[PDB]
Design a protein around this ligand. Structure first.
Ligand SMILES: [K+]
Ligand SMILES: [K+]
Ligand SMILES: [K+]
Ligand SMILES: [K+]
Ligand SMILES: [K+]
Ligand SMILES: [K+]
Ligand SMILES: [K+]
Ligand SMILES: [K+]
Ligand SMILES: [K+]
Ligand SMILES: [K+]
Ligand SMILES: [K+]
Ligand SMILES: [K+]
Ligand SMILES: [K+]
Ligand SMILES: [K+]
Ligand SMILES: [Mg+2]
Ligand SMILES: [Mg+2]
Ligand SMILES: [Mg+2]
Ligand SMILES: [Mg+2]
Ligand SMILES: [Mg+2]
Ligand SMILES: [Mg+2]
Ligand SMILES: [Mg+2]
Ligand SMILES: [Mg+2]
Ligand SMILES: [Mg+2]
Ligand SMILES: [Mg+2]
Ligand SMILES: [Mg+2]
Ligand SMILES: [Mg+2]
Ligand SMILES: [Mg+2]
Ligand SMILES: [Mg+2]
Ligand SMILES: [Mg+2]
Ligand SMILES: [Mg+2]
Ligand SMILES: [Mg+2]
Ligand SMILES: [Mg+2]
Ligand SMILES: [Mg+2]
Ligand SMILES: [Mg+2]
Ligand SMILES: [Mg+2]
Ligand SMILES: [Mg+2]
Ligand SMILES: [Mg+2]
Ligand SMILES: [Mg+2]
Ligand SMILES: [Mg+2]
Ligand SMILES: [Mg+2]
Ligand SMILES: [Mg+2]
Ligand SMILES: [Mg+2]
Ligand SMILES: [Mg+2]
Ligand SMILES: [Mg+2]
Ligand SMILES: [Mg+2]
Ligand SMILES: [Mg+2]
Ligand SMILES: [Mg+2]
Ligand SMILES: [Zn+2]
Lengths: 137, 136, 38, 123
RNA sequence: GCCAGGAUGUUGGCUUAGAAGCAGCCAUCAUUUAAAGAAAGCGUAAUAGCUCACUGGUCGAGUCGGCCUGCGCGGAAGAUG
RNA sequence: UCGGGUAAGUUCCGACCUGCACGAAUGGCGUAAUGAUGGCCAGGCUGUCUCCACCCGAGACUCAGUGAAAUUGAACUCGCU
RNA sequence: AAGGUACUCCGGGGAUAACAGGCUGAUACCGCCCAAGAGUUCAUAUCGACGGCGGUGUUUGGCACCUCGAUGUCGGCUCAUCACAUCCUGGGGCUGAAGUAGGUCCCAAGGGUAUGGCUGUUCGCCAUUUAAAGUGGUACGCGAGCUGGGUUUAGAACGUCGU
């Protein structure tokens, strides 16, 4: 029940009956096509990923990176901005929930971060399975 | 799980497991795991031990299983009385006597083989020993 | 303290000692490696 | 001497008129609550448009008993009815703003100092 | 036991956000040597650091690990005493 | 299952229909009145209970008189493991 | 030459079932061995696949040894007593133990260890307590101590089955 995104549809062939040809009929036909596509195109769930920019003293760098790699996140890289190393990373939005408290816990309240949506990535199969179950009921 | 593809008869008498084994030499590889005790090796046990040793050698060399579970073992369902005919076949076993080479291995160092056989032996209900192929 | 039937060395610093008829694994590097046979 | 099932009157303006004790708090197999003891109550009768409604499970402090209180000289003070003052389940502070009828010096604590101030008489 | 050294192309390369003996995968080397693993451990984002093996010195006689086998040890909690 | 009643209701009351396996004189569905009839609720009332205390009588106990019964292989008829 | 009997009856059997005991321990419950993995990294803080070895008598069972010239059977009440595989309180190791609070294991049986709603219930769910509301054995402890709601006589009805 989630909007399908990042899919191309190519109308290569079709048919019509002058008498029974109605735009509404073609709209229904299109829907049926998408349905059968799902049965064969392996639809997967995607999760919103956020680019996280964390600035902290180098002393707490290891902990920050560990937290990211624990929250199904990947470190995109790091940079020694000023006296506080800046770490760039992409982490699922759902995972990022509660990062503020943990960040401050790990950085002794000397850590700051900014998160902005980057891309949509496939949800882990296990997590995805749960999402389907939840949406189903 | 090894099991006969077809059999002449479905069920077999209990029988006994006396005597010494035939096939007491490493005949296909360089190293072997030999049974020193007497008992029944089930197919599941044979599989578990194989999977263990295969992982240990990390898909290097060759492994020969010298034992096949050809004997059908029956059991009665629970809450059923005695008689009313022999029970149904539940699993397949191999009768083992002292001296039987169970597994052989080649294409690995002895140290790896000794380790791999140790891992497999832990999955086996009988006491075992490491053996090497001899000239005669 | 790990109380097990199978007690053994888990490192190079782990040591097996018998005290008052009990096999024990004392370690100077890791407290997790401390074991008692029982 | 209040126990489970005992019906009490309300000595405040929370809206409750009749409450029933459903638990004597503060120990295993504790039988009774006297003046100054906190009980768990359910509201049996309430007035329309009050602070509390019928069926509510909250706390109360007992402030008057027919059994009464003993004083250190051997004296006794008894009342004609069992009366309680409703408290918040969490804060255990009075829900009402006014106290009706006399109370006793047994409520002279930091917890129940509001009741003493609002009380028309302390005996 | 004790006193020292324990390296150089080189962070082997690839991959890896980073991977430098010590993530993984390929390699798999040569050099100075008394000897030093393209690393057996601890440790680090990665490095470092901390070792070790190896080796040299010291010390001054045995020492080390398999095999077979006898007797013991742990594994081993229950209801009236 | 939903709703009501309770702080909390496998019972009760009102619905729903998915009637394992209602149904029309081996009657169907209602029905005022009636019932030592079945279920459920409330007020009053209370030793029913929290938790029992005291008291008055009849026994029980002691003395005198009278005087049974079931049962019973024999007994010098303890605990524990 | 077919059935019914809870309206029943007689002779017998513990030669043969139901209850409890016994033997057994498949099953059950408890513990251990191996360690693929999970645990950001890291088998073994916690956990643990595939397999393996035990313990208890403790569930469902197997057997038919005791009792059929009778061994009263569920639940409650009253009153208990033992085990320890410990629920609380005491001591301690490890921890993925900052503190607070926990996890896990070891030692420990001295004492302690809810009231209610519903139901015959044990139980369970629910309300509200408590330091905690332990788990088992004791003829599933206890009817020559109580109860008689459950359950299994004779009355009656429904659904169902049967002419
Ligand atoms: K008729
Ligand atoms: K009629
Ligand atoms: K009636
Ligand atoms: K007949
Ligand atoms: K065990
Ligand atoms: K670890
Ligand atoms: K009998
Ligand atoms: K008991
Ligand atoms: K602890
Ligand atoms: K105790
Ligand atoms: K019995
Ligand atoms: K009874
Ligand atoms: K008796
Ligand atoms: K009696
Ligand atoms: Mg022994
Ligand atoms: Mg004893
Ligand atoms: Mg309801
Ligand atoms: Mg009732
Ligand atoms: Mg109804
Ligand atoms: Mg009918
Ligand atoms: Mg008709
Ligand atoms: Mg008719
Ligand atoms: Mg009708
Ligand atoms: Mg007399
Ligand atoms: Mg005796
Ligand atoms: Mg008879
Ligand atoms: Mg018999
Ligand atoms: Mg007999
Ligand atoms: Mg029996
Ligand atoms: Mg397993
Ligand atoms: Mg049995
Ligand atoms: Mg027989
Ligand atoms: Mg008997
Ligand atoms: Mg007799
Ligand atoms: Mg113990
Ligand atoms: Mg005791
Ligand atoms: Mg004792
Ligand atoms: Mg003492
Ligand atoms: Mg209850
Ligand atoms: Mg009993
Ligand atoms: Mg009991
Ligand atoms: Mg009686
Ligand atoms: Mg009795
Ligand atoms: Mg009855
Ligand atoms: Mg009848
Ligand atoms: Mg009919
Ligand atoms: Mg008929
Ligand atoms: Zn260690």
């Amino acid at each position: 029940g989630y909007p399908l995104i990042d899919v191309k549809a190519k109308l290569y062939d079709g048919s019509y009956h002058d008498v029974d040809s109605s735009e509404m009929a073609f709209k229904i036909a299109a829907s049926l096509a998408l349905k059968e596509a799902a049965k064969k195109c392996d639809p997967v769930i995607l999760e919103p990923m956020m680019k996280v920019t964390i600035e902290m003293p180098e002393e707490y760098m290891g902990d920050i990176m560990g937290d990211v790699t624990s929250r199904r996140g990947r470190v995109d890289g790091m940079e020694p901005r000023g006296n506080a190393q800046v770490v760039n990373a992409y982490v699922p939005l759902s995972e990022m929930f509660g990062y503020a408290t943990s960040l401050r816990s790990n950085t002794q309240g000397r850590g700051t971060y900014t998160m902005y949506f980057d891309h949509y990535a496939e949800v882990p199969k296990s997590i995805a399975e749960d999402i389907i179950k939840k949406n189903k009921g | 799980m090894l099991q006969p593809k077809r059999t002449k008869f479905r069920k077999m008498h209990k029988g006994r497991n006396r005597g010494l084994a035939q096939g007491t030499d490493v005949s296909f590889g360089s190293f072997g795991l030999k049974a020193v005790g007497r008992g029944r090796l089930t197919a599941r046990q044979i599989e578990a031990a194989r999977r263990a040793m295969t992982r240990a050698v990390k898909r290097q060399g060759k492994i020969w299983i010298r034992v096949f579970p050809d004997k059908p073992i029956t059991e009665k369902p629970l809450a059923v009385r005695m008689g009313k005919g022999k029970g149904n076949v539940e699993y397949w076993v191999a009768l083992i006597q002292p001296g039987k080479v169970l597994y052989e291995m080649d294409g690995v160092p002895e140290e790896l083989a000794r380790e791999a056989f140790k891992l497999a032996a832990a999955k086996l209900p009988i006491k075992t020993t490491f053996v090497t192929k001899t000239v005669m | 303290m790990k109380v097990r039937a199978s007690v053994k060395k888990l490192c190079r610093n782990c040591k097996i000692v018998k005290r008052d008829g009990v096999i024990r694994v004392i370690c100077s590097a890791e407290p997790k490696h401390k074991q008692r046979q029982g | 001497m209040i126990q489970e099932q005992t019906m009490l009157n309300v000595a405040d303006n929370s809206g409750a008129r009749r409450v029933m004790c459903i638990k004597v708090l503060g120990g295993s197999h504790r039988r009774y609550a006297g003046v100054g003891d906190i009980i768990k109550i359910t509201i049996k009768e309430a007035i329309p448009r009050g602070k509390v409604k019928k069926g509510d499970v909250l706390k109360a402090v007992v402030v008057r008993t027919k059994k009464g209180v003993r004083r250190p000289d051997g004296s006794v003070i008894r009342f004609d009815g069992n009366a309680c003052v409703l408290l918040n389940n969490n804060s255990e502070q009075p829900i009402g703003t006014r106290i009706f009828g006399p109370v006793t010096r047994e409520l002279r604590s930091e917890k129940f100092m509001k009741i003493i101030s609002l009380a028309p008489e302390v005996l």
